[PDB]
Every structure is written in structure tokens, then in C-alpha cells.
């Protein structure tokens, strides 16, 4: 007759590759605490334009 | 007659990082980050 079946090893090989890069993209996010001020209230000029 | 084709292999290989695999064995690699120091200023 007519049948259909999937190959586990070829599908697993592709998933192992994508899960590897999915780990590579979300791994160890930077941890920043006391930084600089980015939103300002009034004009300051030289230092503010550089910040 | 038979004619097999293949590549070379080392008994001990370095592990490197790739896009898909984090630890994959290769025949040879080099270090790009200088971490050692002589301790003296030339």
C-alpha cells in the first residue's frame, strides 16, 4: 500500500544543532548595576551630550 | 579491487567552539587570547 514514517536520527541531528546555537544566543546575559544616567531632567551640555 | 577514501586523524585533539557545537574535537587549534605574561616590562 502507501505508508509514511519519519527518520529519528536525521531529525535529532538537526535539533541537536539548533539547540546548540539556541544555547549560544541566550547564554550568560550581562549583569550591570550602577551605570550612568541616561534620561536627564535639564540641560547640562558637555557632560550630558557625552552621556 | 577496492579504493577507500578518507581523511587523517590525531590520537589526541583539541576542543573548539562552533556555532552549533560547544565542545567539538578537531585535529589542531591555536589560542587567540594571550593570558600568560613574562612578568617583566621589556
Amino acid at each position: 500500500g502507501t505508508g509514511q514514517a519519519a527518520d529519528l536520527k536525521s531529525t535529532q541531528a538537526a535539533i541537536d544543532q539548533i539547540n546548540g546555537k539556541l544555547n549560544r544566543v541566550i547564554e550568560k546575559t550581562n549583569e550591570k548595576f550602577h551605570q550612568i544616567e541616561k534620561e536627564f531632567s535639564e540641560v547640562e551640555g558637555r557632560i550630558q551630550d557625552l552621556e | 579491487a577496492t579504493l577507500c577514501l578518507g581523511h587523517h586523524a590525531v590520537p589526541n585533539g583539541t576542543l573548539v567552539k562552533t556555532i552549533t557545537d560547544d565542545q567539538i574535537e578537531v585535529t589542531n587549534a591555536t589560542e587567540l587570547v594571550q593570558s600568560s605574561s613574562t612578568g617583566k616590562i621589556c
Partner: antibody, heavy 131, light 107 residues
Framework: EVQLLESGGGLVQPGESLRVSCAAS????????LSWVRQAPGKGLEWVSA????????YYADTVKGRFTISRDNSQTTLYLQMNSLRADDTATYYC????????????????????????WGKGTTVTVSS | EIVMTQSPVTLSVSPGETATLSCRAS??????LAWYQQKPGQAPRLLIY???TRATDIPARFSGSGSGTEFTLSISSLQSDDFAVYYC?????????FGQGTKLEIK
């Protein structure tokens, strides 16, 4: 309730075979991975192997790379581990452990996500290999 | 194929004080790291997974941190029933490995 029960084990002569069962009962639909972890009294934990979906694992530790083989019977919901060519150092309390992965991984529900952490541990079966 | 070394082998901490543990790991590891509390005569129990994300319905006194190589586990308010042994696992090398184990004492 996600508890599993380990059956089997016992005393065996070195060189013999022995398979340990793990009745996966509860929340586990058994489209998730399972693992075996052994520990000898007086030693720490050591991951043994893992199973995924159908025949996606094929994941064995270097200590048992050529001896242990992992079976899965989803129809009866039981995980197996055929321990052949047992040596003296194989004496340990073999734990059957659940396996969970971050939801970002495990794209297809059945196949293996190469990053698992064990959450629900079993009661454990003690296997002694001596004379 | 990726060894885990915990430090020290055993530590003595008075009840109430914070007990910081170590889980130094050769080669980088960040995504997956799980801590366990195996009380004597019992199976291990999951505490933290990933690095800092603690397991479900476990006390908030169990804190986790670390990145790549150096990992720590601090128990804020210590109780007399915390005399268990603690372990840490890792990803991946398609082969997860466990730690040696850290014994915790009271008083």
C-alpha cells in the same frame, strides 16, 4: 505526583548481566526524557545515561560506554537499563531520575533537548557486584 | 569528560549563619547547573537549576549564583535539618557530570 519506582537489582557475580526497571508513573506523559544515575555508598553521584523519545539516546557515560544499554517501553510506561559485563566498581544505588529542560529548548516534543536537569528522583535500587 | 570540583570537602557552620559553597568547573558552563540536597538515607532533592533559578516550593534561603567556571551556593538561614550533602551537575558534552560533594555541619 510524578514519582517513579525502581525494581530489580540485587547481588550478581562480576561479568554477568542485570536490567533494572523504572515504572514511570504520574504527571510524566513519557514524551519527556529520563535518565539513570548511580551512587555507591561512600561515593558521590555520577550520571550514567539518558533516554529520549524513541531511539534518540544512545547517551551513555564513558564508564559504561560499551556495557550499559538503555531501553524504553512507552506502551507499558517503564524505563529499563541492561547492565552487561558488570565489574566490581559497578556496585551502586542506581537512581532513576526525571529530566526537565528549559522551555526554549526541546523544539519537537519527543526528541532530545541536549540540556537537561533532573527534578524528580526515585527511591533507588541497590545493586551489589561481588563474589 | 568535564570534571566538577566542589570546595571544601566539608564545612562547619553554626545554625543561623550563611554557608557559602563552591562548585568550580573545568571548561565553560552557564546554561545548565543544578544543586541538590541529599540527606543521609534519602534520594537527592533538586534545589536550584540553571544557575540561580530555584526549584518549585523550596525555601528562599537557598541562593544560587555563578558563571562559566566559578559557581556558589549560599544557605541564608541555616537549620539543624540541613546536615545533608550537596552536589552540582553541569551541561553538557552530551555527558552530564556530578560534583564530588560538600558535607555541611551544624554548630
Amino acid at each position: 505526583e510524578v514519582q517513579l519506582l525502581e525494581s530489580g537489582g540485587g547481588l550478581v557475580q562480576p561479568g554477568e548481566s542485570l536490567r533494572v526497571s523504572c515504572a514511570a508513573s504520574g504527571f510524566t506523559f513519557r514524551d519527556s526524557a529520563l535518565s539513570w544515575v548511580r551512587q555507591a555508598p561512600g561515593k558521590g553521584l555520577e550520571w550514567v545515561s539518558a533516554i529520549s523519545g524513541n531511539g534518540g539516546a544512545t547517551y551513555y557515560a564513558d564508564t559504561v560506554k560499551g556495557r550499559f544499554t538503555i531501553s524504553r517501553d512507552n506502551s507499558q510506561t517503564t524505563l529499563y537499563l541492561q547492565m552487561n559485563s558488570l565489574r566490581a566498581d559497578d556496585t551502586a544505588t542506581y537512581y532513576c531520575a526525571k529530566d526537565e529542560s528549559p522551555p526554549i529548548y526541546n523544539l519537537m516534543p519527543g526528541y532530545y533537548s541536549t540540556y537537561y536537569y533532573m527534578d524528580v528522583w526515585g527511591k533507588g535500587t541497590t545493586v551489589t557486584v561481588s563474589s | 569528560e568535564i570534571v566538577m570540583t566542589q570546595s571544601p570537602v566539608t564545612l562547619s557552620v553554626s545554625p543561623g549563619e550563611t554557608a557559602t559553597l563552591s562548585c568550580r568547573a573545568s571548561q565553560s558552563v552557564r546554561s545548565n547547573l543544578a544543586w541538590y540536597q541529599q540527606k543521609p538515607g534519602q534520594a537527592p532533592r533538586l534545589l536550584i537549576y540553571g544557575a540561580s533559578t530555584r526549584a518549585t516550593d523550596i525555601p528562599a534561603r537557598f541562593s544560587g549564583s555563578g558563571s562559566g567556571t566559578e559557581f556558589t551556593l549560599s544557605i541564608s538561614s541555616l537549620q539543624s535539618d540541613d546536615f545533608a550533602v550537596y552536589y552540582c551537575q553541569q551541561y553538557n558534552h552530551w555527558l552530564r557530570t556530578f560534583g564530588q560533594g560538600t558535607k555541611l555541619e551544624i554548630k
